[PDB]
Design a protein around this ligand. Structure first.
Ligand SMILES: O=C(O)c1ccccc1S
Ligand SMILES: [Zn+2]
Ligand SMILES: [Zn+2]
Length: 260
């Protein structure tokens, strides 16, 4: 379950398919009129995502949008390659656009000093909080979830099977992590952003959460359950509340650790 590792793709519900690596989520939201890809995994992982999309019976040329959660190498490293293979437009939160274009995270990022660069992408455009991305019958909503990065987006949609529908959430990372030289307690905008994001995410309509790091919502345990349970194993309408609570716990632990 390395970030770049092969992983046999699988349908989670309706037209929502996991096409990521062993260690990093990527989702294809499919339609007869074209598809939306969420995240690219790593640079090496792009080749896994591409093969996975084809294994699910889809053409790369039919991927029209690539949606980015946030601009670190593990989620976004593969986007550039996937952009070239598909012709898609890359959509991201406003403050991460420049990072996706250059592959270099800026000094506002808590991890600045400790991050690895990744390949810059073409055709990057911004989306706002609450904005709808539409493609044929697909409708994906952008939710600003800053803190881990300034331009983090959590993406939501509905997938259905014979008219039985579920609210799906591709959850951005909400984690307080930094370089050794960074003090969260000195950066009130980042702390406030994280806290606002926990609150947004714990309020989302959230039947199926797919976390950018899949183990955050126990993807592999759930997949194992699904072998007998079916795809109800991925359903848990508390999952976004739990991802938010774990974010909050990580930040509170960190702020306590920083006290003089
Ligand atoms: O996505 C995360 O939550 C993350 C967490 C710790 C370190 C790096 C990252 S990229
Ligand atoms: Zn990250
Ligand atoms: Zn990550």
């Amino acid at each position: 379950r390395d970030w770049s590792s092969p992983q046999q793709p699988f349908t989670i519900y309706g037209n929502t398919h996991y096409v990521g690596t062993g260690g990093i989520s990527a989702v294809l939201l499919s339609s007869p009129q074209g598809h939306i890809l969420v995240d690219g995994t790593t640079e090496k992982g792009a080749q896994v995502v591409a093969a996975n999309i084809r294994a699910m019976g889809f053409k790369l040329s039919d991927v029209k949008y690539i949606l980015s959660t946030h601009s670190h190498e593990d989620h976004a490293g593969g986007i550039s390659a996937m952009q070239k293979l598909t012709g898609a437009t890359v959509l991201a939160g406003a403050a991460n656009v420049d990072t996706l274009r250059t592959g270099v995270s800026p000094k506002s990022d808590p991890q600045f000093g400790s991050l690895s660069n990744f390949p810059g992408s073409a055709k990057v455009r911004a989306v706002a909080d609450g904005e709808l991305v539409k493609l044929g019958p697909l409708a994906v909503k952008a939710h600003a979830t800053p803190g881990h990065t300034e331009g983090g987006i959590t993406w939501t949609w509905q997938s259905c099977e014979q008219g039985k529908c579920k609210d799906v959430v591709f959850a951005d990372s909400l984690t307080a992590v930094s370089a050794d030289s960074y003090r969260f307690s000195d950066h009130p905008e980042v702390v406030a952003s994280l806290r606002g994001s926990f609150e947004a995410v714990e309020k989302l309509s959230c039947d199926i959460a797919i976390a950018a790091h899949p183990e955050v919502n126990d993807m592999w345990t759930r997949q194992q359950r699904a072998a007998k349970e079916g795809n109800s194993a991925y359903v848990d309408n508390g999952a976004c509340r739990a991802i938010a609570a774990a974010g909050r716990k990580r930040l509170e632990t960190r702020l306590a650790s920083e006290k003089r």
